[PDB]
Amino acid sequence: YDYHFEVNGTVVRHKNKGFGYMERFFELKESCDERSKLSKKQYERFNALFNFFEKNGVICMAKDSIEINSLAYHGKYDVMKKFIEEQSVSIEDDYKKAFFLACLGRWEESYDLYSNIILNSINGCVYYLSQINRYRIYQSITQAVTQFNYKPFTDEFLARIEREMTNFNIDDLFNGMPFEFQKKYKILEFLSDNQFLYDDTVKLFELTNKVSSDIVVLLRLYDNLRFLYENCLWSVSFHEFHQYIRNSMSLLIEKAEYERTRDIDELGFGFFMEYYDFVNISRHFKIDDIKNLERSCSIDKIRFGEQEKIEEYLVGIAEEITKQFSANGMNVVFYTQFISEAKAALYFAKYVKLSEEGLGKIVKALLFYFPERDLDIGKRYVWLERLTKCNELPKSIISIIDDFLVLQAEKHEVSSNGLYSRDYGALIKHFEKNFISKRLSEITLCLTQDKQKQIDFLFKLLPLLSTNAKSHLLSFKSVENINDLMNGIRIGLIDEFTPEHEELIIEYLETRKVNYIDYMSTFGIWYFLEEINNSKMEEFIGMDDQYDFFVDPENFDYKKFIPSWLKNYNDKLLGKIAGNKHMKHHVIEVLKERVKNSNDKRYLEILMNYFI
Amino acid sequence: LDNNVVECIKEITESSRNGKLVFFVGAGVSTLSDYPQWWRLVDKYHEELYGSPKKGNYSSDEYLRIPQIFYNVKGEMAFDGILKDFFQVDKPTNPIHDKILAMNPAHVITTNYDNLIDTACWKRGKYFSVISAEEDVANATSSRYLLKVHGDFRKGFKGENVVLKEDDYLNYDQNYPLISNLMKTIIATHTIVFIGYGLGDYNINMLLNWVRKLQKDSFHKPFFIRTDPSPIENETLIYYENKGLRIIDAASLIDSNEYDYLERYSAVMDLLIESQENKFITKDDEVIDYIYGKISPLFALQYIRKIDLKHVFEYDYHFEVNGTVVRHKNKGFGYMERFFELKESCDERSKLSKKQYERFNALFNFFEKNGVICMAKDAGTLNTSIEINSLAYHGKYDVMKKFIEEQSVSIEDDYKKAFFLACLGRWEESYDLYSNIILNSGCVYYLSQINRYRIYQSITQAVTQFNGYKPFTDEFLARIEREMTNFNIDDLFNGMPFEFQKKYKILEFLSDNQFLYDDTVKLFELTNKVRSEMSEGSMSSDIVVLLRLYDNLRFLYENCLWSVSFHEFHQYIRNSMSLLIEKAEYERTRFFMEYYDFVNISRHFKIDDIKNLERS
């Protein structure tokens, strides 16, 4: 505590009452003559000290860019495998090898290498750090076994490490080292502690003040990341560090959004995201955390820099996804940690502009080689649609989606979201607007009445077929009764109501009218939407409030209106109701009354975009 | 097992936990690795000088005399050559070496001149300062020793480096003064377990001869692991226990063949190792004794955070903020479940001893005042009722002044008065009172140093604001500076008796901001979760935040800790209350502020924070 060493690289005298040796050192650093006056051995010692202080980002005193050198941090899995394959020349090479094995999911080999280094390492700093990391990898192996209860570790190995690590105390490790080590390496004692990021987490509270701190927080986060990755420490993978990164980045982005909002309020017209920030968010955030960030702050207003580096990182993520799942691959220990980072990276790639080739690689990996368990068809479509935000759909991505749809047809869908293969075709039709699928047409030409599952699958994908394919597909389905007509309209059998469909709807409505003493609401919606021009629906008025609310609002009694109707309405229906020039003030007043009664988010959203 | 055997195991495992266990390893453990025994060397020497093996059996004197006669007659070179050809061998490490190491001995003293213990330590990754010569004592690289009291062959396979012949034993005190002194000091300051010895060994009886010269009950009786095939006789056991030995007989514990030495060693070693996690709690009064031993030091503190109770019991249980206990890592007998069963039903509490009945009464009062209710499976409807018994919390400035003016009955009153002086701004008087409390005192002794350092920090920061009004004289500032620069708060907990560091482990967090770490992390996580649930429109997360807030406030104010004035603590309180108020605002349109919420908002919020809360 003689001096303060700040995150920006400046030194400040703090507590030493003796000579200013750091100020003196900087003075020799500035001027070569004073440096030349040193003795030869002291001159070379000063050269070593200057190299150290340059490497560690210590420049000068107060009166006078992040760069992490780690293959593990940058996700260079192939280069890490190459480094592991080669023969280690030193024990520091073995330490780096054991860290790389830990990061590649090969925890048994990592534990064996750490044990070997501990054997062959008795400064004793690599010995101490291997003891730290072997305990950490032993903790990782122990917790992975509990999660899996697949047998990725043999029971012999588990029993052997349990016997080796029984009664082992990491709290005694530093105190068991020679006192020379304990004096020289007092700064490494925190690595044996259960927690080491409490100071930073408590200091994060300054990002919540509403009355620089943010740059200090970011630089300290970069310092922690560089120390834990460049020194090959396995604590960089545990929940404490990931939680610390999540908290720091989330609070920084929320603080920047708060300053942006306050300035907009007070001035009426902040956070800069770069490659390292993108990698930190991808590796440490879950999808829920990114969703919290998106809902809390406008990430679309955050400028993304170093987009070439981010694109290269995303392409590497896609390539590793392919290598993990195109071939046998499937290191379950590595896959468990890697799939979360890949999901977060592809999810966050919505805000990053991507080149055509890189976008092609990423989209291909996402559509085909991403496991269904981690990303179902609905989540996969959500990721793709997010990818279509910054960059519109080119021809190559449309072709990749076409191949995905062809593969789906050949296979023929469990979707937690509720979006299926039809939405990919809708997305294609959104941009190309005239895309016809050659192979889908070919498989329609081979379709028969036997394979009903194919028919009921790609009847939803009808706009991507040709005229002959559409005509052939239409033959296998009948529209005899009203139920068949409703199944067709929900599946897309007909897009323009024929007069016989109108007669069928009339028959259904008359039959229900006779039996007076779900479908009717849809009929009223279609009548309002000009979908049906029968001009006869007025006789079915009186039963359902929605029916007369939709067929003719002029005579509708708005005391029978339920505000919950608007929640079920879609974008097109709400926009049409807004522009009707009738019914408008009634929905305005009912929505105003609803929101004044209770600040409901969906109702305000409806009232705000289309003004209904 | 016998009761005395279980007691011996208890003390050995406790010393191993405390880091005060030392293993004195004999030739039996090396023989378990098939290391060449000394009688083979005596056999070779006898074949050398005399020309034929001995007809009968070697007496105790002969084992030392024959090598001595060989050394005198045939010289040093032949002696060293036979030593080299017999002892330059590679032998593995038996599981007993690993079992000894797994007990985490502070030091290992051995009469073995082999490197088997060194090989085992190097294989297990245990670093010991190996002392086998006189010059090694001063040049020891660590405070944990592998004390080879009879030397070894690390320098070379010569008789000068080891204690083998009778002249080496005759001149041992003269030739090994530092090593013998270190061995005696390690014996006098540690719990000693003898393994690999025959109860008639020369070293064992020499150590007992030294022991007889010590003052009565001024030393701890060493433990002796006897691994002879036949069980020890009653008379021999009585004699050697009156000589100052606590003997654990392997032959009495288990049944094994005459030559199954490895199994006999392993029985005792495994029973010692497998009892490290054991707590030896079977009957109900053993439950009350253990919980009382864990909780009684906490009686000095007014309140204990429930999140801190998992550290008191070494993560055996989860102590949630709602008052419910959850098994976390208790693989043994459930003492918390048994304690709550005793609490609910008076029948089992009635069948308790008088001392243990009073201990249960104290434990029940402590858990009642601390809000610990029962286990999770028993938990019913629980309310968030908080009370803070502090005059400083409620802003009772006049009552605080009256208490300050009153004469102090005890050091606890002095501590509370110093905290009240700090809360009333009279920082110089509070600092002097804290110094007086430190002088007159160790829970209060440790807490006054933290508070004195915290009040010194507050004094320093306020002086900077005014200069960057003279509340403190320059003489006072100079004196407190002189007293405080040498003081470092990071090593205050380690600069405590080892009893304090174990009884009051939860007080270690008060030195740094590790005290607020778990609550801060939980607050961030629950803020994200609550905001997500609020945005999507869907025990309670708000109740967890409120209960943790109240726990922190009660612990910091009732224990009279100056951390209540910390900027970080104020930020924590402000963030928690802001989240609670946001949730209450959302809960309304589908939680109400009491007096404590009003006081927390007034004390810990800024006007801008309140303005933002009203805006949102």
JSON list of N, CA, C and O in Angstrom, two decimals, chain A residues 420-440:
[
{"chain": "A", "resi": 420, "resn": "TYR", "atom": "N", "xyz": [-43.46, -22.85, -36.03]},
{"chain": "A", "resi": 420, "resn": "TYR", "atom": "CA", "xyz": [-43.09, -24.06, -36.75]},
{"chain": "A", "resi": 420, "resn": "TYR", "atom": "C", "xyz": [-42.52, -23.70, -38.12]},
{"chain": "A", "resi": 420, "resn": "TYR", "atom": "O", "xyz": [-42.26, -22.53, -38.42]},
{"chain": "A", "resi": 421, "resn": "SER", "atom": "N", "xyz": [-42.34, -24.72, -38.96]},
{"chain": "A", "resi": 421, "resn": "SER", "atom": "CA", "xyz": [-41.66, -24.54, -40.25]},
{"chain": "A", "resi": 421, "resn": "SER", "atom": "C", "xyz": [-42.37, -23.55, -41.16]},
{"chain": "A", "resi": 421, "resn": "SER", "atom": "O", "xyz": [-41.74, -23.01, -42.07]},
{"chain": "A", "resi": 422, "resn": "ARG", "atom": "N", "xyz": [-43.67, -23.30, -40.94]},
{"chain": "A", "resi": 422, "resn": "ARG", "atom": "CA", "xyz": [-44.38, -22.34, -41.77]},
{"chain": "A", "resi": 422, "resn": "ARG", "atom": "C", "xyz": [-43.82, -20.93, -41.60]},
{"chain": "A", "resi": 422, "resn": "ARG", "atom": "O", "xyz": [-43.85, -20.13, -42.54]},
{"chain": "A", "resi": 423, "resn": "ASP", "atom": "N", "xyz": [-43.30, -20.62, -40.41]},
{"chain": "A", "resi": 423, "resn": "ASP", "atom": "CA", "xyz": [-42.79, -19.28, -40.15]},
{"chain": "A", "resi": 423, "resn": "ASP", "atom": "C", "xyz": [-41.50, -19.00, -40.92]},
{"chain": "A", "resi": 423, "resn": "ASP", "atom": "O", "xyz": [-41.25, -17.85, -41.29]},
{"chain": "A", "resi": 424, "resn": "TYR", "atom": "N", "xyz": [-40.68, -20.02, -41.17]},
{"chain": "A", "resi": 424, "resn": "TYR", "atom": "CA", "xyz": [-39.52, -19.83, -42.03]},
{"chain": "A", "resi": 424, "resn": "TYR", "atom": "C", "xyz": [-39.95, -19.45, -43.44]},
{"chain": "A", "resi": 424, "resn": "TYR", "atom": "O", "xyz": [-39.36, -18.55, -44.06]},
{"chain": "A", "resi": 425, "resn": "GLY", "atom": "N", "xyz": [-40.98, -20.12, -43.97]},
{"chain": "A", "resi": 425, "resn": "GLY", "atom": "CA", "xyz": [-41.50, -19.74, -45.27]},
{"chain": "A", "resi": 425, "resn": "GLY", "atom": "C", "xyz": [-42.09, -18.35, -45.28]},
{"chain": "A", "resi": 425, "resn": "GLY", "atom": "O", "xyz": [-41.94, -17.61, -46.26]},
{"chain": "A", "resi": 426, "resn": "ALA", "atom": "N", "xyz": [-42.78, -17.98, -44.20]},
{"chain": "A", "resi": 426, "resn": "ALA", "atom": "CA", "xyz": [-43.31, -16.62, -44.10]},
{"chain": "A", "resi": 426, "resn": "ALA", "atom": "C", "xyz": [-42.18, -15.59, -44.09]},
{"chain": "A", "resi": 426, "resn": "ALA", "atom": "O", "xyz": [-42.30, -14.53, -44.71]},
{"chain": "A", "resi": 427, "resn": "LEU", "atom": "N", "xyz": [-41.09, -15.89, -43.38]},
{"chain": "A", "resi": 427, "resn": "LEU", "atom": "CA", "xyz": [-39.94, -14.99, -43.36]},
{"chain": "A", "resi": 427, "resn": "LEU", "atom": "C", "xyz": [-39.32, -14.87, -44.75]},
{"chain": "A", "resi": 427, "resn": "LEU", "atom": "O", "xyz": [-38.92, -13.78, -45.16]},
{"chain": "A", "resi": 428, "resn": "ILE", "atom": "N", "xyz": [-39.22, -15.99, -45.47]},
{"chain": "A", "resi": 428, "resn": "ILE", "atom": "CA", "xyz": [-38.70, -15.95, -46.84]},
{"chain": "A", "resi": 428, "resn": "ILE", "atom": "C", "xyz": [-39.59, -15.08, -47.72]},
{"chain": "A", "resi": 428, "resn": "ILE", "atom": "O", "xyz": [-39.11, -14.22, -48.47]},
{"chain": "A", "resi": 429, "resn": "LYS", "atom": "N", "xyz": [-40.90, -15.28, -47.62]},
{"chain": "A", "resi": 429, "resn": "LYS", "atom": "CA", "xyz": [-41.85, -14.49, -48.40]},
{"chain": "A", "resi": 429, "resn": "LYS", "atom": "C", "xyz": [-41.86, -13.02, -47.98]},
{"chain": "A", "resi": 429, "resn": "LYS", "atom": "O", "xyz": [-42.32, -12.17, -48.75]},
{"chain": "A", "resi": 430, "resn": "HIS", "atom": "N", "xyz": [-41.38, -12.71, -46.77]},
{"chain": "A", "resi": 430, "resn": "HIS", "atom": "CA", "xyz": [-41.33, -11.33, -46.33]},
{"chain": "A", "resi": 430, "resn": "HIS", "atom": "C", "xyz": [-40.32, -10.52, -47.14]},
{"chain": "A", "resi": 430, "resn": "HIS", "atom": "O", "xyz": [-40.56, -9.35, -47.46]},
{"chain": "A", "resi": 431, "resn": "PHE", "atom": "N", "xyz": [-39.19, -11.13, -47.49]},
{"chain": "A", "resi": 431, "resn": "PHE", "atom": "CA", "xyz": [-38.10, -10.43, -48.17]},
{"chain": "A", "resi": 431, "resn": "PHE", "atom": "C", "xyz": [-38.09, -10.69, -49.67]},
{"chain": "A", "resi": 431, "resn": "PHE", "atom": "O", "xyz": [-38.11, -9.74, -50.47]},
{"chain": "A", "resi": 432, "resn": "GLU", "atom": "N", "xyz": [-38.07, -11.96, -50.09]},
{"chain": "A", "resi": 432, "resn": "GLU", "atom": "CA", "xyz": [-38.03, -12.27, -51.51]},
{"chain": "A", "resi": 432, "resn": "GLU", "atom": "C", "xyz": [-39.37, -11.97, -52.17]},
{"chain": "A", "resi": 432, "resn": "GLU", "atom": "O", "xyz": [-39.42, -11.40, -53.27]},
{"chain": "A", "resi": 433, "resn": "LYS", "atom": "N", "xyz": [-40.47, -12.40, -51.54]},
{"chain": "A", "resi": 433, "resn": "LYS", "atom": "CA", "xyz": [-41.85, -12.12, -51.92]},
{"chain": "A", "resi": 433, "resn": "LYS", "atom": "C", "xyz": [-42.27, -12.86, -53.19]},
{"chain": "A", "resi": 433, "resn": "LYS", "atom": "O", "xyz": [-43.46, -12.87, -53.54]},
{"chain": "A", "resi": 434, "resn": "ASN", "atom": "N", "xyz": [-41.32, -13.51, -53.87]},
{"chain": "A", "resi": 434, "resn": "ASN", "atom": "CA", "xyz": [-41.66, -14.32, -55.04]},
{"chain": "A", "resi": 434, "resn": "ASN", "atom": "C", "xyz": [-40.85, -15.61, -55.10]},
{"chain": "A", "resi": 434, "resn": "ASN", "atom": "O", "xyz": [-40.67, -16.16, -56.20]},
{"chain": "A", "resi": 435, "resn": "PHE", "atom": "N", "xyz": [-40.37, -16.11, -53.97]},
{"chain": "A", "resi": 435, "resn": "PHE", "atom": "CA", "xyz": [-39.54, -17.30, -53.97]},
{"chain": "A", "resi": 435, "resn": "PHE", "atom": "C", "xyz": [-40.39, -18.55, -54.18]},
{"chain": "A", "resi": 435, "resn": "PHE", "atom": "O", "xyz": [-41.40, -18.74, -53.50]},
{"chain": "A", "resi": 436, "resn": "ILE", "atom": "N", "xyz": [-39.97, -19.39, -55.12]},
{"chain": "A", "resi": 436, "resn": "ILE", "atom": "CA", "xyz": [-40.59, -20.68, -55.38]},
{"chain": "A", "resi": 436, "resn": "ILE", "atom": "C", "xyz": [-39.55, -21.75, -55.10]},
{"chain": "A", "resi": 436, "resn": "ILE", "atom": "O", "xyz": [-38.41, -21.65, -55.56]},
{"chain": "A", "resi": 437, "resn": "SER", "atom": "N", "xyz": [-39.94, -22.77, -54.33]},
{"chain": "A", "resi": 437, "resn": "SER", "atom": "CA", "xyz": [-39.02, -23.83, -53.92]},
{"chain": "A", "resi": 437, "resn": "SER", "atom": "C", "xyz": [-39.04, -24.94, -54.96]},
{"chain": "A", "resi": 437, "resn": "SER", "atom": "O", "xyz": [-40.07, -25.59, -55.17]},
{"chain": "A", "resi": 438, "resn": "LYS", "atom": "N", "xyz": [-37.89, -25.17, -55.61]},
{"chain": "A", "resi": 438, "resn": "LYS", "atom": "CA", "xyz": [-37.80, -26.20, -56.63]},
{"chain": "A", "resi": 438, "resn": "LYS", "atom": "C", "xyz": [-37.99, -27.59, -56.03]},
{"chain": "A", "resi": 438, "resn": "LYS", "atom": "O", "xyz": [-38.80, -28.39, -56.52]},
{"chain": "A", "resi": 439, "resn": "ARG", "atom": "N", "xyz": [-37.25, -27.90, -54.97]},
{"chain": "A", "resi": 439, "resn": "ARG", "atom": "CA", "xyz": [-37.29, -29.25, -54.41]},
{"chain": "A", "resi": 439, "resn": "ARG", "atom": "C", "xyz": [-38.61, -29.54, -53.71]},
{"chain": "A", "resi": 439, "resn": "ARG", "atom": "O", "xyz": [-39.08, -30.68, -53.73]},
{"chain": "A", "resi": 440, "resn": "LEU", "atom": "N", "xyz": [-39.23, -28.53, -53.09]},
{"chain": "A", "resi": 440, "resn": "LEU", "atom": "CA", "xyz": [-40.56, -28.73, -52.53]},
{"chain": "A", "resi": 440, "resn": "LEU", "atom": "C", "xyz": [-41.57, -29.05, -53.62]},
{"chain": "A", "resi": 440, "resn": "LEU", "atom": "O", "xyz": [-42.43, -29.92, -53.45]}
]
